[PDB]
Amino acid sequence: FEEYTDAFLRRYKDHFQLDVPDNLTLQGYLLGSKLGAKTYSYKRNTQGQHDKRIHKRDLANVVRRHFDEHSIKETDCIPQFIYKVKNQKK
Amino acid sequence: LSRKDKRRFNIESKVNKIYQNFYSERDNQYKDRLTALQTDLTSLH
């Protein structure tokens, strides 16, 4: 499920209250070079900082595992899905 | 088809139950939403 976007994964983590740090953006991932390690973002996002970020692949794998693990029951969700579809205009 | 239509009545009743629950808890739900939006605004400030 790495084919998705950053917004979907961030909102998934927020909704399910998962304890996984937000994924690093593709540009943020490529930022981390030898000279790229001297920038503010990389020097403040690597060690000793609670705001540390991690790659998109691992977060995608974690979300895929949690999504497949999370079982579903049609009676609980299908009416909720119909209500949300008929409510989006409001 | 009574068996096939059984799921239809179940789905319709569940949707109506959701609507009735919403119509019962309008006040508390929207108070919660207003408080959440206000705290979001004051945090973003």
């Binding site: 299908i78 119909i82 | 096939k4 799921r7 239809r8 789905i11 319709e12 949707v15």
Partner: peptide, 14 residues
């Protein structure tokens, strides 16, 4: 209410 009938027929057809 009638709109739910066709939606459920769609779901069972799926």
């Amino acid at each position: 209410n009638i709109s739910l009938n066709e939606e459920v027929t769609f779901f069972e057809k799926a």
